[PDB]
């Protein structure tokens, strides 16, 4: 009899609890990276002195060691650094094994196989599959959120509140993120396998899934229909024929399900809060702690000058010249991660917007943008920091556009009408946190102007 596997006990319920994934409705093994899990492997015999067990884990359709999307690791007695399998105890035929993943491992669906070398033969069997997510309880993961209350809100809370309407008429709507409902984690994983990024280079897309900047920005693309047949099709016409009035959705679950079940065909119809709430499901499901931000008098600047320009022909007439507009409210998301590309001082909250307003490298996508960065006017940085600066802290200019000499001189500058009552749900309650002061310096002060100026000189 050659050394084989009789059966394996994944200790699913136990590992899910320790990995903080026990709430998803699923019989799968769901795990977080950088964190060991323990399995019991029942062999047909004892390990002999010369026989070798190799674990193999792969994710995605073109997996490879060099892209970090396949790993091969021996059952060992040692502390190793990558993927590793430690033999904790042998008890007759039964091996107690502690497996860990690196904290830099791509998130996704993985396959796990075991390759046995014994009697100058080789056997290879599939043990199973698991999902691996981002790990915000792990101090070295980029998505680390050390505060426990904040973590329960921004990861584990499946129900929320979005602020809506206009400065004079604030309202709030119930929103069921529903990340733990049946099939939803699975669907949110599907999303990543349907991006442009993936259609054009799957192997490299899947390798980039270790990075929340990358996952996060793909999601900002894929939650809208534009470009890629993503989840939701926006409609601001007023006419909601052939679908659901945006005001009639209560959460993300029906949306994401309807998307999957139609064969990844867009769902009709959404507006910004519907994009923000759906994106929030996706971000929380995958391990990126996130929340919903609403901005009243939100600028749509359409030419990267940090200002909303409604133009006036000299001698004082309005003109049709202008794409620049202002929404009563706009809603987007913030995701929590360090920014290794930017500097330690730019970590924390990063803006992500799935509403199709402006293109970015030719695609309806937006973010991530260091909130800290936007506030300090550091707008040369990746990604889309000019657009989002305008959103919360544009000036509003009036101009004089002479029809004849081409000269353009300013009538009046309004430096405070944009970006008001910026709001997100409280930790633990349904109270409104104001986070205006997190996005910009106080309106009508010095630093606020000298940072507007700093920012205006960083567009070049």
């Amino acid at each position, epitope marked *: 009899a050659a050394l084989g596997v009789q059966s394996i006990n994944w200790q699913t319920a136990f590992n899910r609890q320790a990995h903080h994934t026990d709430k998803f409705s699923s019989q799968e093994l769901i795990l977080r990276r950088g964190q060991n899990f323990q399995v019991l492997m029942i062999m047909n015999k004892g390990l002999g002195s010369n026989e070798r067990l190799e674990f193999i884990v792969s994710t995605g359709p073109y997996p490879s060691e060099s892209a970090m999307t396949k790993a091969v690791f021996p059952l060992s007695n040692g502390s190793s650094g990558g993927w590793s399998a430690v033999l904790q105890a042998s008890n007759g035929n039964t091996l107690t094994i502690s497996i860990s993943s690196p904290a830099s491992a791509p998130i996704g669906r993985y396959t796990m196989a075991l390759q046995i070398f014994s009697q100058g033969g080789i056997s290879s069997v599939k043990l199973g599959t698991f999902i691996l997510l981002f790990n915000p309880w792990l101090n070295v993961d980029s998505v680390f959120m050390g505060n426990h209350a904040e973590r329960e809100e921004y990861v584990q809370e499946d129900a929320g509140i979005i602020f809506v309407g206009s400065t004079n008429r604030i309202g709030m709507i119930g929103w069921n993120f529903g990340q733990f409902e049946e099939d939803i984690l699975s669907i949110c994983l599907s999303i990543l396998d349907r991006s442009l990024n993936f259609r054009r280079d799957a192997a490299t897309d899947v390798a980039s899934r270790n990075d929340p900047k990358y996952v996060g920005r793909v999601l900002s693309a894929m939650i809208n229909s534009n470009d890629d047949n993503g989840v939701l099709a926006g409609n601001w016409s007023g006419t909601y024929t*052939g679908g*659901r009035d945006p005001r009639s959705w209560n959460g993300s679950v029906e949306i994401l399900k*309807n998307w999957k079940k*139609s*064969g990844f065909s867009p769902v*009709r*119809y959404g507006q910004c809060w519907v994009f923000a709430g759906t994106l929030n499901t996706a971000l929380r499901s995958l391990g990126i702690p996130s929340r919903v931000i609403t901005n009243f008098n939100s600028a749509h600047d359409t030419d990267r000058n940090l200002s909303v320009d409604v133009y006036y022909d000299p001698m004082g007439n309005p003109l049709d010249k202008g794409s620049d507009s202002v929404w009563n409210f706009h809603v987007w998301n913030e995701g929590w991660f360090v920014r290794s590309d930017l500097g330690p001082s730019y970590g924390g909250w990063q803006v992500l917007d799935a509403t199709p307003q402006e293109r970015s490298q030719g695609v309806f996508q937006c973010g991530p943008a260091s909130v800290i960065g936007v506030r300090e006017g550091d707008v040369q940085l990746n990604f889309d920091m000019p657009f989002i600066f305008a959103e919360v802290n544009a000036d509003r200019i009036t101009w004089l556009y002479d029809n004849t000499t081409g000269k353009q001189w300013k009538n009046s500058v309004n430096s405070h009408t944009i970006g008001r009552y910026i709001s997100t749900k409280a930790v633990g309650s349904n109270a409104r946190m104001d986070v205006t002061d997190k996005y910009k310096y106080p309106e009508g002060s010095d630093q606020e102007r000298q940072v507007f100026q700093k920012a205006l000189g960083k567009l070049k």
Partner: antibody
Amino acid sequence: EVQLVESGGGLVQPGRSLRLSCTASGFTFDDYAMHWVRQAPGKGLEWVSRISWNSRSIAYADSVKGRFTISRDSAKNSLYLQMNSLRTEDTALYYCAKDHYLGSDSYGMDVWGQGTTVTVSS
Amino acid sequence: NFMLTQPHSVSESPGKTVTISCTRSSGSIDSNYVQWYQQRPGSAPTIVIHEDNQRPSGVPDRFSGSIDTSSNSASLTISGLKTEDEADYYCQSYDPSNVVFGGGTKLTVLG
């Protein structure tokens, strides 16, 4: 209540044409895909054709493709099936059905008409 | 392209529970929503389950739908059978173009 009323059925000869109509009431017609499904005496349901809410997406069973054309008319709240080059095997009860799904491209039949009978014989 | 296969017939006594399976020939059963319809002899079909497991307004909770990934099948379960439940039952799904019906199951309530 939703009502769907099919008409235009009858005895018709191989090779000829027949036009079925379905008038819809008690819901917003243009919000939904519509279908034709048929059923030969004592047999099962066979889906025939689907048209999307805005008529931009149409599909047909292979057994009828190139012979049957589906269409709809918003102002008349009506669905139609133009059946050309009929065959003895097209004999069936033809049902009109409203799709269940609003705003997504999934398909199910939430309401069905009583149907209109088509017999194909020379 | 796929087929949906149902059993030709099922039967049980009044008050008992019966299950009708619907197996998808290729592709995953949970890729696309499953509907179930009842058709009484000489009558138009009516829907009894939609979106795999949801019940239309006014369908008794004796009717339930399920999906079983491991057998690539959907199931319609009817508890507390009444003599009026005697009928043909059809499952239905689709791919992103074509609608597919199962071949139907005659449910007899044994008398």
